[PDB]
Design a binder for this molecule. Structure first.
Ligand code: 34P
Lengths: 250, 28, 10
């Protein structure tokens, strides 16, 4: 996160850290949607252009964390993956279309003050909140500036942007399975996700029932926090059917 | 069931530093 | 990063 700030304790109890066994390093952000399922971006797991093709035994899931590098004893929990599911029509070749993947934990994790799941949007919620000008929240342990790393979890609030503006800001073919967010050049304020934030959740709080909902997944961007450029997130609701499809039968 | 409700905030009716920023942008 | 307990590395 660039131009953000330190999250407060228990602010994002669903935030997940995708950690690599060897070498031990941060791999990506993710989110807890139930006691046995983790949602993240597909490119965190598969991405041929960089020879990236991880398996269930290559990673570990770290939940309930605040600090980026410390093993927060008695607070965080580590889980092993039992299976991974990449969306079958994930287009890593062109524009990272349908950048999404589900991860099945070997065993359920017990919730606590620091470990709680976020809600998945339904049509009504998505329809009512997914509007330009409405702000969302992105969290991550990624880089603080375009390339170093933050000591603690970073948070930033960003406004959703009109499709047209998003489209005219890049040469990348935009699809309906993605949306973009960030401040415009004149708006004065700034901020963005960056390397290392991948797979992180973009969430919004409902004014109707006060629950937090995850509307997106940090997918891609061109540089970090450059004027005239915006971050792109996977449109979670649009892939809601595949999500239920999987979980349901597995 | 009780997804989206944080133990240290919503469940004890406390508000975080900036959630006010989000709600003030939802101008329907 | 601070080392993780081997018990999970299995
Ligand atoms: N400014 C952001 N929000 C932002 C910037 S990089 C990121 C995480 N995703 C990524 O890094 C993904 C993974 C692979 C290619 N990604 C990128 O973001 C690449 C651009 C993609 C566009 C779609 C086709 C493949 C390349 N840009 C990097 C840069 O501009 O520095 N979020």
């Amino acid at each position: 996160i660039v131009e953000g700030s330190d999250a407060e304790i228990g602010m994002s109890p669903w935030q997940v850290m995708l950690f690599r066994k060897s070498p031990q390093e941060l791999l990506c952000g993710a989110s807890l949607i139930s006691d046995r399922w983790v949602l993240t971006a597909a490119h965190c797991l598969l991405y041929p252009p960089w020879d990236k093709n991880f398996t269930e035994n290559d990673l570990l899931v770290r939940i309930g964390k605040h600090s980026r590098t410390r093993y927060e004893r008695n607070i965080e929990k580590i889980s092993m993956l039992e299976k991974i599911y990449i969306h079958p029509r994930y287009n890593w070749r062109e524009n990272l279309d349908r950048d999404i993947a589900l991860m099945k934990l070997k065993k359920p994790v017990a919730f606590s003050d620091y470990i709680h799941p976020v809600c998945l949007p339904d049509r009504e919620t998505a329809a009512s909140l997914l509007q330009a000008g409405y702000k969302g929240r992105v969290t991550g342990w990624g880089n603080l500036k375009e390339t170093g790393q933050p000591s603690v979890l970073q948070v930033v609030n960003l406004p959703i942007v009109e499709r047209p503006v998003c489209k005219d800001s890049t040469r990348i073919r935009i699809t309906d399975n993605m949306f973009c967010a960030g401040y415009k050049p004149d708006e004065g304020k700034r901020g963005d996700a960056c390397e290392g934030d991948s797979g992180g959740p973009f969430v919004m709080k409902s004014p109707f029932n006060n629950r937090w909902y995850q509307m997106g997944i940090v997918s891609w961007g061109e540089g970090c926090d450059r004027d005239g450029k915006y971050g792109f997130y996977t449109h979670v609701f649009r892939l809601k059917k595949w999500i239920q499809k999987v979980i349901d039968q597995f | 069931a009780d997804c989206g409700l944080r133990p240290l905030f919503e469940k004890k009716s406390l508000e975080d530093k900036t959630e006010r920023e989000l709600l003030e942008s939802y101008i329907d | 990063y601070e080392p993780i307990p081997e018990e999970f590395a299995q």
